[PDB]
Amino acid sequence: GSHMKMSFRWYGKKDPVTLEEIKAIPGMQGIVTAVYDVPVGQAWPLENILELKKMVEEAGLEITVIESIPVHEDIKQGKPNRDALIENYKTSIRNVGAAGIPVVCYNFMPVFDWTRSDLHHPLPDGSTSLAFLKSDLAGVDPVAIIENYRQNISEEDLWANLEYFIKAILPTAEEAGVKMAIHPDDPPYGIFGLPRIITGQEAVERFLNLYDSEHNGITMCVGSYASDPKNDVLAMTEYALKRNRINFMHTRNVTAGAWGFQETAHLSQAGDIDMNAVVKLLVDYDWQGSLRPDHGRRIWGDQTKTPGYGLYDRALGATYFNGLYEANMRAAGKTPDFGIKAKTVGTKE
């Protein structure tokens, strides 16, 4: 049965938005966060991880996803030395497994985690948001590694590098107790001369096939994949569900076609994704994991300076998904849960 834990990303002590605040989003169960005091490829110690946990539980919550142990460019290049970095990932995994966290989320995106033309792009309703102006500055160098990718590393070269990678980490992930969740390349296509392999359905099916385990899975970022219209999320979500290989939902909305993409409000009809259908699937498949609103719009006074990661609209997403999940569960002859235990503190009957 669907134990779908609603979640929020939180960057720790240094976040604009606080734990207490997140706590006040009704239905909110999980925290999604990362150890930030240790260089990429370098290995997370148990104590950085136990210090996040200690805090998160202190504010009546639990870390459901560790979002991103950063995958070092050397591994992404497949340079001779990677085994060194790779082992640090194993210690990271292990120690996550040692803090009682079920799911680590990563990406094998060379150089560019995301590409964003406009951080302040207007929208019909008056909000600004993130968009991908396919024309604007794009198709031009963003002023060593890049030319290595540009020149030698092919998609299949990157594929094999990735095969290498996860073939080395999994038996570890399996003994730690941690399911791996690859986050699609964002945008779901190669640009800037660099390769992006993790592009859609066939990519997932080769990916999933690299190591055949529930521990080896995807973070179904339905908004990322979908921002190239060539790929189709419902059947993509559906497929992974079918095979039992989603260990993390991101669930944000974005609008697109052959012109490029813009991020928008979460609500099904402010963009190309029918979000109802996405979750209705999570219902029918009794799916079990954490979904985050993930990215919002800047609305109201949101002084959150960092890009798409302010509290307000993200929280708006979340109760919208609460409403979606609430609904379909009953509609399914089921009873949805949000981890709520007390209604009151100090009356009841």
Ligand X SMILES: O=C(O)[C@@H](O)[C@@H](O)[C@H](O)[C@H](O)CO
Of 99 and 222, nearer to Mn ion (C-beta) is 222
Give how far the C-alpha of residue 113 lies from the chain's centroid of Cα atoms, to the nearest Å: 12
Q: Count Cβ neighbours within 10 Å for each residue of 232-256 and write b for 16 or more, e otherwise.
A: ebeebbbbbbeeebbbbbbbbbbbb
Helix then strand then coil, % of the chain, to nearest 5: 40, 15, 45
Catalytic, 183? Answer yes
Of 192 and 283, nearer to ligand X (C-beta) is 192
Report the site for its own copies in 93-132 (rule: CB under 8 A). 122-127
Task: Compute the least distance from the CB of residue 219 to ligand X, in Å.
Answer: 8
Catalytic residue among 72, 121, 250, 266: 250
**Which of 23, 79, 90, 116 is the binder for its own copies (CB under 8 A)?**
23
- Other C-beta atoms closer than 10 Å to the C-beta of 225 total 28
Single-letter amino acid code for the residue at 310: G
Closest alpha carbon to 19 in 50, 49, 63: 63
**286 vs 59: CA distance, rounded Å:** 29
Instruction: Map tokens 């709520």 to a residue.
Output: 340
**341 vs 321: CA distance, rounded Å:** 20
Out of ligand X, its own copies, Mn ion, none, what residue 262 binds, judged by CB under 5 to 8 A for its kind, is its own copies
Catalytic, 215? Answer no
Rounded to a whole number of angstroms, the CA Rg of the chain reads 20
Closest alpha carbon to 336 in 322, 319, 317: 322
Of 46 and 316, nearer to Mn ion (C-beta) is 316
Task: Compute the least distance from the CB of residue 244 to its own copies, in Å.
Answer: 24
Report the site for its own copies in 235-294 (rule: CB under 8 A). 255, 257-260, 262, 264-272, 275-277, 279-280
Of 250 and 266, nearer to Mn ion (C-beta) is 250
Catalytic residue among 221, 225, 302, 320: 221
| Residue window 114-133: x/- pattern of binding to ligand X, with contact defined by CB under 6 A | x-------------------
Catalytic, 250? Answer yes
Catalytic residue among 309, 313, 320, 325: 309
Task: Compute the least distance from the CB of residue 282 to its own copies, in Å.
Answer: 12
Catalytic, 120? Answer no
Interface residue list for ligand X (CB under 6 A): 113-114, 183, 186, 221, 224, 250, 294, 307
